[PDB]
Amino acid sequence: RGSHMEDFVRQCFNPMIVELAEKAMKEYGEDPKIETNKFAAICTHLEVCFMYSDGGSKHRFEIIEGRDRIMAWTVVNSICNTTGVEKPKFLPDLYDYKENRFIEIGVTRREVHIYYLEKANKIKKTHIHIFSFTGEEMATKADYTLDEESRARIKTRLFTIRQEMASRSLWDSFRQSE
Numbered sequence: 001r002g003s004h005m006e007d008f009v010r011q012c013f014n015p016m017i018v019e020l021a022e023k024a025m026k027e028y029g030e031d032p033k034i035e036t037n038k039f040a041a042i043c044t045h046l047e048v049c050f051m052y053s054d055g056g057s058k059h060r061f062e063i064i065e066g067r068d069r070i071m072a073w074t075v076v077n078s079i080c081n082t083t084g085v086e087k088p089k090f091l092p093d094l095y096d097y098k099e100n101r102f103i104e105i106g107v108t109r110r111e112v113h114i115y116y117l118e119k120a121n122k123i124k125k126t127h128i129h130i131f132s133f134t135g136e137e138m139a140t141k142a143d144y145t146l147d148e149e150s151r152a153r154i155k156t157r158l159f160t161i162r163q164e165m166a167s168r169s170l171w172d173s174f175r176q177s178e
C-alpha cells in the first residue's frame, strides 16, 4: 500500500536523511509506508537540523537529532557533565558550543507563535528556534544564533519543498495533517 507521498519523499530527500527518518519512526513504532506525512515531516526537520549545524563555525554545533535515542542521551550527558549545563527533560536537536545552550529546532505548517508556545510550554533553559513553511522564524529572546544568510537558505529550502508537494497535490493533505 504505497502512497504518492512516500515516493515523493524518497525522490525529494537525500538517502542518508530518508534512512535516518525511517530508522527513527520504526524505533518509535511508526511505519513510513502508512504515516507518510510524518515521514515527510521527519525528513524535513532532519534536513533543517543538518543545514543549521552547517551554518556555524567548524566545531560549533553538536548534532543530537538523527541519533539512536540511547546515543543521543549519551552525548547530552557528556555535554552536561563537561559544560555544567542542566540536563534537559527532553531530547533537543543540537548543542551550541559557542553559546553553551541546547537548541530545539521546530518546523511547523501553522503560525509562528503557537508552536513556539506549545514548544515552550513543554520544554520548561534550552534555546528554541522555529521555522515556517511560509518563511517566518522565531527564536528565544529574539536571538537567532546563525547569521541571516544561513537561516535564509533554510527558509528557501522549506518553501521549495512546499511547492514540490503542491505541484503534486500533496500539500493540502500535508498541511492539515499536522
Ligand SMILES: O=C(NCCOc1ccccc1)c1nc([C@@H]2CCCN2C(=O)CSc2ccccc2Cl)[nH]c(=O)c1O
Binding pocket: 024, 025, 026, 028, 030, 038, 041, 042, 045, 065, 091, 092, 093, 105, 106, 107
Ligand atoms: O525529537 C523529537 N522527538 C523524538 C521522537 O520523535 C519521533 C520520531 C519518530 C516517530 C515519532 C516521534 C521531536 N519531536 C517533535 C514532535 C513534538 C514532540 C513529539 N513530536 C513528534 O512525535 C512529531 S515527529 C516530527 C514532526 C515534525 C518535525 C519534527 C519531528 Cl521529530 N518535534 C521536534 O521538533 C522534535 O525534535
Ligand SMILES: [Cl-]
Binding pocket: 056, 057, 060, 098
Ligand atoms: Cl559562528
Ligand SMILES: [Mn+2]
Binding pocket: 065, 091, 092, 093
Ligand atoms: Mn528532535
Ligand SMILES: [Mn+2]
Binding pocket: 045, 093, 104, 105, 106
Ligand atoms: Mn526539533
